[PDB]
Each structure stands twice: as C-alpha cells, then as structure tokens.
Amino acid sequence: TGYDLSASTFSPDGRVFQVEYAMKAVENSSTAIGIRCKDGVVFGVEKLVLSKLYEEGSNKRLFNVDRHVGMAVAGLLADARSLADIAREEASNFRSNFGYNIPLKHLADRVAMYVHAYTLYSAVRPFGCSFMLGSYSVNDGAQLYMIDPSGVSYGYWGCAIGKARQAAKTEIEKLQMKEMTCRDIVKEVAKIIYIVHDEVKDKAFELELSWVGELTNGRHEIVPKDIREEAEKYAKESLK
Amino acid sequence: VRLSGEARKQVEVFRQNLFQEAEEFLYRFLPQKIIYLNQLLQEDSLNVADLTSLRAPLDIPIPDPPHKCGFLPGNEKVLSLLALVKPEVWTLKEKCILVITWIQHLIPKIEDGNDFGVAIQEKVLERVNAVKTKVEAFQTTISKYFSERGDAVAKASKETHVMDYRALVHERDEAAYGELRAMVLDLRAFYAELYHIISSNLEKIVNPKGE
Amino acid sequence: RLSGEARKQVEVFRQNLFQEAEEFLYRFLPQKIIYLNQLLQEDSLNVADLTSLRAPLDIPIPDPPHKCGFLPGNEKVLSLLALVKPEVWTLKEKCILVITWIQHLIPKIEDGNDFGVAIQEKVLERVNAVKTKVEAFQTTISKYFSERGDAVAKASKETHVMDYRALVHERDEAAYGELRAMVLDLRAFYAELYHIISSNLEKIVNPKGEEKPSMY
Amino acid sequence: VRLSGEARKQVEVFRQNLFQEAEEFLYRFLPQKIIYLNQLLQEDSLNVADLTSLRAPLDIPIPDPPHKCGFLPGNEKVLSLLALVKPEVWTLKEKCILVITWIQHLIPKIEDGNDFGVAIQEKVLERVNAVKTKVEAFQTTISKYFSERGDAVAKASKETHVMDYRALVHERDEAAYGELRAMVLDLRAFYAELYHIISSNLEKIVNPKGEEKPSMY
Amino acid sequence: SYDRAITVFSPDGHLFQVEYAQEAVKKGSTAVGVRGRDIVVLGVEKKSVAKLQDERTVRKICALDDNVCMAFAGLTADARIVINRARVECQSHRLTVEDPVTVEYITRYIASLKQRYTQSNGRRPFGISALIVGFDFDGTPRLYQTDPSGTYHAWKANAIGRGAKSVREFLEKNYTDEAIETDDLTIKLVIKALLEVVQSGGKNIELAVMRRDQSLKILNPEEIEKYVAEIEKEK
Amino acid sequence: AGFDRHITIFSPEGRLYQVEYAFKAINQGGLTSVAVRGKDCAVIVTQKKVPDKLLDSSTVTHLFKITENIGCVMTGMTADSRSQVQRARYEAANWKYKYGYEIPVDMLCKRIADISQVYTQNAEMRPLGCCMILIGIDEEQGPQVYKCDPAGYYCGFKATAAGVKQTESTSFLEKKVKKKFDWTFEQTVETAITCLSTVLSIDFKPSEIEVGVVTVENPKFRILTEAEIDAHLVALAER
Amino acid sequence: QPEAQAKVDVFREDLCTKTENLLGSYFPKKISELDAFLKEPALNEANLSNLKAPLDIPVPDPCGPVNCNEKIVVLLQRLKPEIKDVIEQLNLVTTWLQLQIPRIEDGNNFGVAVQEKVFELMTSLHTKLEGFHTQISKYFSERGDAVTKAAKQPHVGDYRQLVHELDEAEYRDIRLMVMEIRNAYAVLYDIILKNFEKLKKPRGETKGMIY
Amino acid sequence: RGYSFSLTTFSPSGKLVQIEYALAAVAGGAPSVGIKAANGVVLATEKKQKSILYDERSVHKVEPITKHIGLVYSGMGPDYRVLVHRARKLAQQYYLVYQEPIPTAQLVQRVASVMQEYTQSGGVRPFGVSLLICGWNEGRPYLFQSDPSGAYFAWKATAMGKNYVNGKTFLEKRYNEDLELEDAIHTAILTLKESFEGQMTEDNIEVGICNEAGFRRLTPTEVKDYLAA
Amino acid sequence: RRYDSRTTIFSPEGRLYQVEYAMEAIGHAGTCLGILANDGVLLAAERRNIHKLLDEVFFSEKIYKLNEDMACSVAGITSDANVLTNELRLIAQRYLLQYQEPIPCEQLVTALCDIKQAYTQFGGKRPFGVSLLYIGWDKHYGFQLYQSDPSGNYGGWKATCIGNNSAAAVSMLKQDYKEGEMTLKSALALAIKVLNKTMDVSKLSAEKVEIATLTRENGKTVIRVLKQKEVEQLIKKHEEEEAKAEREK
C-alpha cells in the first residue's frame, strides 16, 4: 500500500497516514504536562538524563517564545527548536506591526497554520513535534494551548504530551485546577510527573518546571531552585 | 441480458436466503458451535491422560519359536471419538462454503479505484479458503486412519513373526486420538477466527466501495 | 556465408510455412468449425440418457455360498472415440504450425518498439495453452482403455464385488461425457485461434512496424 | 591464473573448434536437415491416412465361453518409423548442446551495464534450453512406447477375456504413429527456429558488449 | 539499474548514458578526416538520394567560419544546433578579441557545450561526434575530434560513425608522410578510405577540402567522379 | 492500479479517485453538520463533541465568522478547516477593499471553491479534506445557504447536511421541504435540531450542539448561547 | 478472407445469443432446481446409520455378491448430470468471454482486466468442478478395493468400517457438491451480470479523435 | 504500463493516453446538445439534481462569455468554471485591444490554446471537460466544440456526455440545415429526451439560444412552454 | 527493461524511443501530400473528419498559410499543430520586422525544427507529435517543398506524402512523377491519382479532400484553395481518364 508514503496522498478510506505516523513521533518523547489555574499556567517536563556526561540545564524542552509566553515541547527536538524560532518570529512581527504583545490564541493559530502548511505538500514532511504554549495577561487571563503535528489547536485547562499522556491526563483530571493557585500547582505537577515516570524503563529524570502568571507579573520564567527542591521533595514523599 | 420476471424472482430469493443464512451462521450457529466444542473438549473421553490406556487389544497368536487369526475389531475409543468429531468437520466445511459464496456475492462491480474494499474481501475469502483446505486435510486424515489401521493389522496378521507391525497398530491408534483431539481444538479455533475476521471487517465486507 | 542451396532451402521453408499458415487460417478453420458443429448436431454426440450407452457385462454373478467369456468394449463410446481422435491430432498439428509461423515472424531482438513482440508472445502463450489442453485430451483418450481394462479384469477376478462392475459402466459414462466435451472445446479452440490471430494479425506479421523517418 | 603454453593451446583449440563447428552447423547442417526432415514428412509412410493400415495382428487366442499365445511381434511400421526418427532426435539434442556451449563461451565478463547484448544471449539461451527439454521429452516417450506396449500385450495374454487390453495395444500403436509424425514436424521446426533466432541476432550474440568506446576514461 | 540517469555512477564508476550516446554516434553515416601538409580533407558518406529528395538540404559538412569547418556523425538535429551555436561563438569570439578563432578554441567550446549537457539530468547528451578541421594562424593543419562525452583529441587522421573501426584500421595501414605529400593524394586517400565502407563510390560520398587561405570547397560530383576514376584505374 | 495516489492522473474511466477519497476524509471525523434555510433566517447546526474534560469547551468550535454578516460551519479535518476559514476571511476582506461592498455569500463560496479546484488540478498539494457551508443574508435574494466541497462544486441549497449522517439527514430534510408550508425562525431552528437529533439518535443536551443563525432582522452572524440552545431544545421536547 | 470471418461471426453471434439466454433463464432456473434438490429429504439425512449398506461377507470364528449402496448410487445418478451440465455451461461462457477479448492495444487496458478477472474465477470453477467429476469416479473404485480387501482378509475388522465410511463420506461430499454447483451458478451469474458492460464491450465505442 | 500514468509520455503506437482518459471523463458527464439553426443556435443540457434541496438558481451549466457568445459543457464542473472565467477574461482582453466583440472562432481558438497549455506540463492534469461554444457573429451562427486535448471542431449539430453517440445519430437523422431555431429547440429537447432516464421538467434541463440579439438563457417558464409540446 | 520514457534517456543501441513513438502517431493521421512543379507547388490532403454534422467554416482544416509566400499542411496532433503554426507565423513576422524582407522558406522550417529538437532534448516536455509539409516560393531557390518530423529533422522533397498510407503514396509518386516535366495541372492529376489509391473510399468525395496551390502571378505569390467545383472537375477528369485506360484493355 503506497498510500502511507506521502502526506499529499489520501488513503482510500479518507485518512492521511503520514500525519498519524508523525503523531506517533511525540509518544516516543518523555512526558510533559502543563496545567492552568486561576493565577497562571505552570509547565513541567520530565527530562530524562541520558548520560551523566551531559550538563545540567541542557536539552531544555521549555523555551521562552516571548517575554509573556512560554513553550513546552514533545517530539523531535530539532523540529521543536525550529518551531520555537518560528513562534518567536511571529511574536516579534506581531509586536512590530500591531504594537503590543501577541495574544496567545492568535500565536497558537499562526504557528498551527505554519505547521498545517507542511501536511499538505508532498515535498516536505509534517513536523515531528507536539508542543504546549502558555501565557498570562491581565486582560486575556491564563491561557494554555496545545498544537499537534497536524496543526490542530485547542485550549486546555490541563494538558499532557508524550509517552505517558493518558496516565498523566487522568492524574491531572483528578486535580480541580480552576480554584487552585500556582505555588500549589507546581507541587502537584511534580507529583504527576514523578508518578508517570517509569523507573525501570527510564533510568533517571531531572524535573524541569516553568510557569507564567501574576506572580511573575506576566513573564514566563524558570522556577527558582528553592521552589523546585520543595516540589521535588513533596513529590518524592507523596510517591511512597 | 433480458431478465424474466420468474428469473428475477429466483435470483432475488437466492440472494435473500444466502444473506439471511450468513447472518444466522455468524450470530446464532457459530457461538453455539463454539460452546459445543468447548464442552466436547471438557468431556473426559477427549482428554485421556494416558494414551497407553486406549491401546487396543490385538489378539493374533505369537508364533511359537523354531494357527489362525480370529476377528480383530477396531478400537472402540477412537471410533467413538471419530463419531463425535466427523459431523463437526463436515459442518464447518459447509459453513465455509456459505461464507465464501456470501462474500463473493458481496464483491461489487469491477472498477479502477476504491479497491481497498475488494482487497479486504479478497483477504477474508483467502483466509476462509485456507480454513477450508485445512478442514479437507482433516477429512483426509480421518479417511486415512481406517485404511492405515487395516493395512497394519492385516500386515501383522499375515506376518505374525514381526512384532513391529503390532506396535505400529497401537501407534496408529494413539496418533489417531491425538489428531482427533487436535481436530476438535482447531475446529473451535477456526470457528472463532472466522467470527473475528468477519466481525472486524464486516463494514468493508458488506460495503467495500464506500457508500 | 550461406550457400545458394542453403539460402534457397530456408527461403522455401519460410514461404511454405507462410502459405500453409494462410491456408489453414482462412480455409481450414472455418471448415473444421462447421464440421465440428455438424458432429455436435449428430445424434451420437447428443445421446441424452446414458443408461442407453451402458453396455452389458457378462461376467458370471457368483452364487451365494466358471470363467468369463470374451468381454467386449462398449461399441458406442469406441465409435465416438474413432470420430473424435483424428480431430484432436489434427488440431495439435495445426497449433504446432501456428507456433512455428509466429516464431518465424518474431523479429530481431531489439530494445524498444517491443509492443509487437509482446503481442506475439501473448498469442504464443495462448496457442501453447491450447496445445497443453489438446495433449491432455490425448492422454485422457489413451488412459480410458487402460483403466476400463483394469476395471473389467478386476470385476472378473472378483465376481463377488459389484462395485467394479458399476465402475466399468461409470467409466463408459464418463468417457462419453468427456468425448462430447472434447469435441465442444476443439470447436472453441479453433475459433479462439482464429479470433486472436485475425484480431492481432497486423502486429503478428509486422511487429516492429513501418520503417521510420530515420533521425540518423 | 598462471597458464602453461600447452594449457593455453588446449583451451584455444577447444574454443576454435567450438566456433568453427557452430558456424558450419548453422550455415550448412541446419538447411540440409531442414530439407531432409521436410522430405521425410512428405514421405508416404509418415502420411498414412487409414490408421487400420498401421494396426498389426496380436495372436492372442480369444477365449471361447465355457491354449497359449505365440510370439507377439512389435509393429513393423512403427518400429521402422522409430528407426528413422531416433537418429534425428539424438542429433538435434547434440546440436542444441553445441549451440548452448557456443553461446555460453561467447558470454562476456560480467559487467554493470551495456547488458543488452548479454540479455539477447540469455534470451536465445532460454529458447535453446526450451527445445532441449522438448527433445528430451521426445527421447523419453519413445522408450515409454515400448515399455507400455509390452505391458499391454502381457496383460492381454494374461487376461484373454478382457478385449480392452487388445484395443489398448492397437491404440498405443496408433497414438505412437501420431506422436512420431508430430515429432518429426517439431524437429524440423526446432532446427528452423534455431536458424532464425541465431541468424537474426548473430551480431549481438558474437559481440554482445560491442565495439570499443571512444574511452572518455 | 544504473543506466537510467546520467548523474548516477554505476558500481565500478561507469556513466552509462553517455556511453549509450557514444553508441548512438556509431549508427550515423561515416565521416573521415585527414591532415595533408597544406590541405585538410573532410569526407562524408551520403545515405541515399531517394529520387524525390533535394540533395542541397542535407549536407553533413558545414563551415563554422572562414577558417574552420566540421563534419558530424550522429543525430542530425543535434548537429544542426551545435553547428549554429559554434558559429555564433565564432563570430562572438571575433567580436570580443578582434581575431579569428583557432581550431582548438572552437573544438573546446563545442566540447564544453556537450559536457554541459552531460553533467546535468533533465538534459540528454548531444548524440553527435564531430570532426573539426581548420588552419591556424601559423598555417599548420589541424584536425580535432569530439564525442558526446565532451573529451576532444587531435588526430592526424580519423573517422567517425558506422564502419569507423574498419576505415580507421585501413587508414592506420595506409596513412604516411608519402600520402600527405600531394593534395590530390590526400583527397584520393580519403576517397579510398570511404570506398572501404560504402555501397558505391561516386554517388555516395560528399567530400570537401580546405586549403591554406581559401574558403571551404565542396568538390563537384564530376571532380569526385574523376578522382574515383583515377583511384579505380590504378588498382 | 496506481491510478489513485496522485490527484493529477485520470483513471481509465476518468474519475480522479483522490478527490473522492478527500470526500471520505470528511466522514472520518465522525461529526455531522446541518444547514436549513427559512423565509427570513438561515441556521447552521453541528455536533460539538469534547473528547476530554480538560479541553476548554469555549475553544473547540466548528462555527466561524468569515465576516460580520457571513458565518460558516466546517466539517472535516480541523486544521484544513481552520486554514480554509482563514483564506475565506482574507478573500472577504480583500473583496471589500477592492470593490467597496461586502462580499456576497455566493461569490465567497465561488472563490473558495475555485481555490479548491486549483488544489485538485496541481500535483504537489492535496485537496483540503474539509467541507464548508456558508450562511448569510443578501438584500436582493434574502437568506442564502451554500456549500463548498473538496472538488470545487459550490452549489447553493435550500437545506443541506455534511458529515457521516449526510444521506440520512438529507433524506429527512427532503421530506420536510416536500411538505412545504413555511419556515419562520423558530421552525427553522427546530427543523435543524430535529434533523440532527433524529439521524444521530442523540436526543441532545445544550452542550452537545452549537448553533449559529442569521436573520433579515439582525443580519450579523451570531452563535447562540447555551441558554438559547436549551430554550429551543426544551420547546422541542414539550411539543 | 471475409468468408472465414463471416462463418466465425455466425458462430460468435450464436454464442452471444446462447450465453445471453443461458444467463437469462438457465442459470436462475438451475439455481432454483439445485436448491430444491438440496432441500429434498434424500440429500439431508438425520442418521447415516440408515445410509449404512449391508456387507454379507462372512465373519471368521467365496462371499456372496456384495452390492453398491443403492442410496449413494441413486444420489450419484441424479448428481452426475448436474456436474456435466454446469461444466458445459461454464465452457460455453468461457469461450464467449475469450471471443470478446479485444485486439491487444497499449491503451484502455481496463475492460481487458475485467475480462481477465472474470476469466480467473471461471478457471477456478472449472478446476473445482472437474475435481468433483473425478471424485464421483474414484468413489466406486475405492469402495470396490475396500470390499475386496475385506474378502481377502475376513478377520480384519476395520475394512468393513472403511467401506461404510467411504459410503458416508461420499454422501456428505455429494451434498457439498450440490451446494457448490448451486453457488457456482449463482456467482457466475452475479459476476457476469455486474460486469456485463465491460465484458461485452471492453474498449468502448468512444473515439477521441485527437488525431 | 508507464504510458498510462504519465501525461508527457507517448505510449507505444503513439497515444497520449491520459488525454483519452480525460475524454472518457467527458463522456461520463451529463448530456449536452448543440444545434446550429439558420437564424440561431441552441445549447441544451440536463441539469438533473440529486434532490429537491438543491436550489436551481444558484448555479448554471450554461454561461455567457460575452453578449453574443455562450457555452455549455459536459464533464467536470470545476474545470468548466476555471475556463469560463478565463474565456470571459480573454474576450475582455480582445475588446480592450481591438474595441470589437471577439469572434466566436477566435475565442474557441484561445480557450483551446489554454487547454493545450495545460496538457504539456506534468505537474498539471488536463481539463476533464469539453465545451460547446456557440456564437453569432457577422450575421451568421456558429457552433464549436473544444475537447480536453486542446483541439476544436465546428459542428452543425452535435452532442456530448452520456449516450453522445446515440444522440448524434438521432440528430443526423433529424437535422435539416433549413431549420429555424423555433424548431431547433424542439429537436434539441428531443435529442436530450432520448437519454434522460427520467421525466424531464423545466428545472431538470437548462437551455440557451443565440441569435442576432445575442446569447440568452430562456427562463424556466419559457422552457416549460417549449416542453408542453 | 524500459528505456522508453522521459524522452531524455538514450537506450542501449543509442535510440530515443519517445520520438520514435511520436513518429508512430503521425502515421495514424490523415494523409497529406505535396508535389513540386515547374510553375507552382501544391498541397493536397485528405479531410479525415468526414462526420456528416461538421461545418467547413474555416479556410482549411489541414492547410494553413504561414506567410504571404508560403503555406503548410499538418499531420499529427491538432493541438500541437496549432501551437506550431502560431509559432511559425510569429517567426516569419519577426524576420519581416527585422530585415523587412519575407522569411526564407528553409529558414522558417529550420527555426521550427529547432523548436521541435529542443522539446526532444529537455526533460519535462514531450516531443511534438506532428509532421507537416511546407510549400513556398523564395527569391533564392524559387519554389520549394519541405517536410518535417517530430525529431526536428527536415528535408527538401520534389514530392512526398505524410500520414496514413504514406509508403503507398511515395511508391506511386516515384513511378509517376516526372522530374523537370510537371506542370500544376499534371501535378493536380497525379495528386488525385495517389489520393484515390491511398484513401480507402472508392470515390474521392470532393468533400473528403482539400487541395491548395501556390503560384507566382504578377510578381506576387498567391495561395489558393481549389473550390469544390474545381476538385469535382478534377476527380471527374481522373475517373474518365482511368476508365478510358480501362476501356482500351
């Protein structure tokens, strides 16, 4: 069956299988989750330490695509870094032309359309990355968006990507994020990541966290290490 | 071709009866056969632990070292197991024929494209034909048991000096018991596999070329 | 370096093959088609109830608890066989002729412009298929006598078994049916040979086609 | 590999003998054989029309309904025709072997491209191997005739009451005559087809890779 | 496998499409060239009149410029394109450097064009080989040959096209300083060489000469008849 | 075969099977949309299915506003739908810029459809696997309903459906127009909801459906609130 | 020569009319007739103990003439004409389809492929039906050989069982053959009816006139 | 084989088979009929709709390129509209350059040139549609056909689409050069009446006429009046 | 296996099979004929389209005028023919604009043949599946007839035929054509003869042929298409002459 070879093609039953094959790419990735609460959005990533040789604070999967928005990625890291460059360019162009910080919904739509361009044409493959975007602005509020390799974009109160998406999603489902505040949400994100991590298959992980919210005055930033250590100790204690 | 009214009625009733029988076989007879074969497997006769127990008595005089043969009956145990299994074998062959013709009638007019449905149909009927040829092989072995045991018993009676023919007769009975038990197991397996394939691919089998 | 004699010899063989092919194609095939149609119309091939062609077997039935006389073959089926057998051999001969004619028409092997050659190979495989079927029919004709002789000999040797007597009668019946089918398919084969050859004649005789403008 | 002068001489002798014999065969022997087989099938014996002329007596005593069988000869017509045919079929098999070896020695060194000439060589090899198998089939069926007829007459003598064995013996003779005339026709056709294919494609057969290139290398 | 694209190398590093174009050259009509001491003679066979065709339209020998001419064996349309391109290059070179083209310069240009078509897929090689003749500024005779591959080589004398192997063997045997001594001897040599491979002598050869400082002259059919008669008589 | 797998090549029967596969891609989504016209109003309804609780229900929508007085509902691939929606908005604004008046619904549908044609004729890109249904009010012609499909066919309609239950839904609607008496706004919305609910067997609740309307009184396309949808739904159940 | 084409065209017109009449009337009628025979009580028997035929062979502590199973013989006698008929009709339609094959041409090979597929199924049916015809012949020989073995060896018990089992197997095979001949008629009618346009007119009358 | 799929590949025996396949696509299209009367030319085609839900006024199969030219098609609907827009644009370019209405022959030449332009490139497919282009110029009627191949022909009367051969035979039986358009419209609806497989009504057909006045699509009431006979 | 695709691959033995397959196409075309005479040159063609419901609105279906001083007849794909004729007319008018003299016949043929060669050589485009005859008068070489093929190769012919039964036409012309002795009337009679021989129709309809003649009168070339009455008279004269030749035997 030559239908799956290219994305220009359609299956006889109406399915573009290259895109689904690209969606299978992110499942290879280690998990990443983002939770939205009243104050803001918290992101977390389970960054597996492949070797002791690799420096800490390397292979970062949490990027800052503008001062007021952050990006968390799962799937091919090369494609993800390129998509982050695209998103940064889109945000800068929006600021330059329209004179203010890009709305997250619009940014998600533009990067999603850029992604969707690739599924159509035969010359170029779909992206191999699924990524989450999150921002807080006093006008818009807390917003969390996820973009699949297809270019589908939606807003999620809580979201997970990667290998352990389903388990992470049920754990997130039993949380009541809407009432909660960010400084608790970091602890619960750590708990969920420690739960879904598989010690047997994955040797070790270093929890990589970020948030954006009013506590930052609407700037996405990496967690202060004291708060990281507190959340990690809480997660280890709860794990039992 | 000009279609007579009676001819149209005849073809329509055949198609109707075939499709009705296909639904009936798939949804009513087939699970009933699966449970029947389950309980038949659970029966004690078909799960005899010690195959030396069903070793039949072969009464032919040992020749005195340097008179006549009485009637030698066949092994009642394997004969009873044959009486049980053989109807199931021929029944599966018949139902396989029904499924094959049902699928073939569902095959649509040949057209250039949208052929994945007909590909699925061809795959399913290929598996069904494979099941049928295995079933025919079971029938061949069932026929072979009698002729082989008769040849072995006749050879032992004709040549009483050679004991290996008597050992061979006992081996034929043991192998027959094993083969018949395997036949019951794989008959159940074939019934279940037919249900699985047809139920899984039913939408394309009944409606291959889209709408 | 062909001798004049050698060149003349191969030339006459090629020309005779071509003339024989044309004669067969345009005269022999229609005549044999109508003749085989007449045979099918004939009552001998059109026997309805095969109990009629059943022939008596005079092996003595054994009494419940001496030598069988000359037991004849079935006159009807052996006469029908006498009718059909020459036609089968004739068709095999003519199909061999068609094969030879096509092979002589096959051109020098060259890359490209191979569609005519492909047509030639396709008609060649079809005629080879009918060759296979007619030689198979010859083998069936030959085996009938041997199997019926074995059957009647067995029936004589074991008078108690009547399954062998039924087998003799059944062999006669199957032979009659097979002979009618043989005549029918001989007609069909002649017609199919004519159809393929006549339809694809232009490419068969001239595969590569007319000489081109010669870009060189 | 290191070769002695004597070794090179022996190999070159085999090569030149094969080449000259192939040339002589296809140019001279093939036309002669074509006409010989043609006139042979034109001979009246091969064109016997009434097959009952061919059937020969089997002196099996018919059993009267309620002593021994004399020497039962082979069919003189069929055995004479076989005596004619057998040299031809064995000769054709020999010549096809020669053609096979000639083409195979002409096969060049294996190479990545310009393989169209060797493809032609392979195609003509396919054809000559096909006719080789066909003539082997002829060679086995001629023996099958004798074995089958002997078994048939033995059966007829053993079981006199069965007349089907007698009819079978006659039928074996008739089928043998038909097979023989088809055989000589096929032998002539094979000689002619060999001539045609080899003559048509001789240039690529003898020189598959072709003339030397300008050598851009 | 490796013969369908010009770009792809084969195992053992053979580019086979260019070889196939070099084979295409062999199909063409024969051409022969010889360097006399004061003459360069270029001879080409003529396929056939066909009796309803005008001979003037078909001419294998052509003059690129006053001092250079070529003959070709291979695809006629490709030859026409290459001839036109070389002619415009000749006039452009005269425009650029105020000097007449050298024979090696024009054969280099033609070779570079053929090479340019070989290197890139989406273009097929020019299926021609050419024999370029001219007299340089010093007055030395020059004969060069080109092929679809794009290599060029000077030849004292050469042939291209069908029967090139046979006629060049004959020419390797026959050619010597003695034969080049006379202009008539050079013309007779090339005529005999073409006679080695041609159906008929006078009818089927078109021949031309270039002298030291004269334009190309296509010899008249009567002159060719006289020369073949002289050649025929001597035998 | 091989006559599929490229849009350009024609079948031996001249059918272009690839676009026909793009039509199947619409049904692969498992959602249905219905549009029915009225004397003074046009409505679009479609299923709204939220796979996960975590998804923000506000963000997921198949109803988009091409311009102030035109609305669309997309059925098929979500990404291709959003892209076609963006192209439609660009076409509408560019029409206003060039020609000085709001684009007609028919011309918008025609522009989008001929774009789909350039997709189904050029090799490298694929037809967008989505279907559009546009509703608006034209002063001359009153309400309008139109549909684009992946092929480039753009015909207007009295009522239509798209998605998996298209044949059942158009069978239902065909009966209702045949017994034509009228359609006021309430009856229009009721007909749409009854069609969708009957063909799906859903017996909807307000969250499960999203409805958008245009009316000659209020020409602007508006997406009704859950309260308005429940108001219409309860009226259906009561009678 | 046009006279040869005239005669062959007369033959092909007769074939076309015969095949059209075959599909119109004979195939539906035969489907009806064969399902009627299938539902007849004789073909479906509850207990094969009734099917069992006596062996008058003596049993040990020259035999009277043993007889064929009259049940099997009557069933075979009604079956064999059906096999001959279906083979004849299959040969007719096969020849018709072969004659309709167009001149070989580079383009528009669709329609030739349709004929190829239908020809493939016709070939498969031919193979299976010829197998049935062979089976009917070999049944008598097998039963005869078994009873002769029993007579030679009265003591051997299972040769009696071999004879009885051959009879039962032939009965079940007879009913399966009736089923398969019915389904063969039906599937041939279905395929040819669905694809008749391309089968009769593969290339199509359309002429583009690009030239 | 490979000849089947490629559009820039001559098959053996020299056939551009993808174009023949496009003509097969045309043949599947709905019937269309064109009859050139002495005083006019009628274009007619069936506009059979899948359901009552379809609004007939929304789209038309018969379109005017200019005041005095109009055309009808059989084949692919989208391709028809691509070329109808291009035809209108070409006619307006002619009017800008020469300030005269374009002749029908010139317009069919230009649109056929476009259709040929598409066939050459591999990246594109041929237009799977054929047209009947009718016009009145220089006090004379015209009827033309333009195929997917890029070729054009001039027909007194012809039919395209389903059963086009049978329709053409019916026409050549019924055609008389002396016919006025009042009769010719009747003959055209009869030619379509051969091939509907349904009860034709005012909605199910679309018909247009050209004359000294120019092209027009006669209304549903008009075609009802003509259908009444 | 397959070295016949993409028109840019030399097959082993060095043959471009796409152009040969294109040359195969012209053989299907309606026969076209051209004969050269001392006083003029003519083009005659068989109107293969003989459908009853076709209108002869145009100047000619096969014959095209490229310039004041020359014309052409085309056999092959009609769309490629239209393209080539448009290119020819543009080339001629470009030469007239540049040099203010009429295009030489050989130069125009050579230019179009260069185009046709170019389409062979580059990958994407197919070769032009067309062969067309050119007739013209030029001051340098007088009356001239030229033929071209899909390969881009051209030649000058005294008389030639392209299309269906071109071999039969050429065989008939070889014996009949008298070098240096033809006049336009005799050439017209020869054209009718060879057309009757080649064309399958027993009687040349005089609506199934189109004949055009090129002559120089009063220092200006005139390209004229013989009207139906003229060709009717020609076929009547040929039928009478052939019958009288028959009657004598």
XYZ file of C-alpha atoms in Angstrom, chain B residues 1-4 7 10-11 14-15 17 21 69-74 79 86-87 90 93-94 97-98 101 104-112 122 132 139 142-143 146-147 149-151 153-154 157, chain G residues 20-21 23-25 28-29 31-32 39 48 59-61 110 114 117 121 149 153-162 165 168-169 172-173 175-176 179-180 182-183 186-187 189-190 193-196:
96
model
C -29.442 -9.822 -20.691
C -33.231 -9.837 -20.676
C -34.445 -10.804 -17.198
C -37.666 -12.770 -16.959
C -35.826 -15.413 -13.256
C -35.382 -16.772 -8.460
C -32.153 -14.772 -8.262
C -31.355 -16.969 -3.698
C -29.614 -13.738 -2.683
C -31.708 -16.704 1.507
C -28.174 -17.670 6.254
C -6.482 -65.338 13.174
C -9.833 -64.629 14.764
C -11.822 -61.496 14.102
C -9.828 -58.386 15.067
C -12.087 -55.411 15.951
C -11.164 -51.769 15.656
C -14.125 -44.943 16.681
C -16.632 -36.045 11.932
C -20.028 -34.222 11.869
C -18.207 -31.622 7.552
C -16.792 -27.248 5.521
C -20.418 -26.493 4.619
C -18.785 -22.671 1.560
C -21.665 -20.474 2.724
C -20.314 -17.511 -1.632
C -18.333 -13.373 -3.423
C -21.869 -12.068 -3.861
C -20.921 -9.005 -1.827
C -17.982 -8.332 -4.181
C -19.010 -5.316 -6.324
C -18.630 -4.438 -9.987
C -15.014 -4.135 -11.072
C -13.872 -0.518 -11.203
C -10.485 1.132 -11.442
C -10.272 -10.989 -1.126
C -11.475 -24.998 4.182
C -11.196 -35.267 6.392
C -9.985 -39.296 9.124
C -10.305 -41.410 5.986
C -9.199 -46.738 8.800
C -7.140 -47.744 5.771
C -5.031 -49.398 10.642
C -6.427 -52.055 8.320
C -3.156 -52.280 6.411
C -3.487 -55.123 11.228
C -3.514 -57.181 8.028
C -1.743 -60.984 10.966
C -27.448 -14.350 -23.069
C -30.220 -16.962 -22.940
C -27.786 -16.119 -18.085
C -31.388 -15.021 -18.574
C -33.119 -18.361 -17.989
C -31.638 -18.850 -12.423
C -33.689 -21.950 -13.176
C -30.159 -22.310 -9.064
C -33.808 -22.906 -8.166
C -33.790 -29.238 0.486
C -26.222 -42.167 8.479
C -17.001 -63.269 9.722
C -14.397 -65.782 10.998
C -14.906 -67.909 14.089
C -9.192 -1.555 -18.441
C -12.260 -7.041 -16.131
C -10.705 -11.314 -13.526
C -12.932 -17.090 -11.487
C -9.585 -56.323 0.854
C -8.981 -60.735 4.934
C -12.294 -61.560 6.657
C -10.594 -61.290 10.055
C -9.617 -57.629 9.615
C -12.428 -55.674 11.229
C -11.722 -52.121 10.113
C -12.048 -52.847 6.374
C -15.802 -53.108 6.958
C -15.550 -49.705 8.612
C -13.545 -48.399 5.665
C -17.011 -44.694 5.985
C -20.816 -41.909 4.370
C -18.053 -39.627 3.092
C -21.627 -35.868 2.547
C -19.441 -34.986 -0.442
C -24.481 -32.842 -0.736
C -21.490 -30.487 -0.652
C -24.208 -26.854 -2.714
C -21.087 -25.839 -4.623
C -25.568 -24.115 -6.950
C -23.193 -21.460 -5.649
C -25.033 -18.082 -8.718
C -21.596 -16.454 -8.532
C -24.409 -15.119 -12.927
C -23.649 -12.365 -10.407
C -24.304 -9.552 -14.783
C -22.451 -6.901 -12.804
C -19.559 -6.586 -15.271
C -21.525 -7.246 -18.489
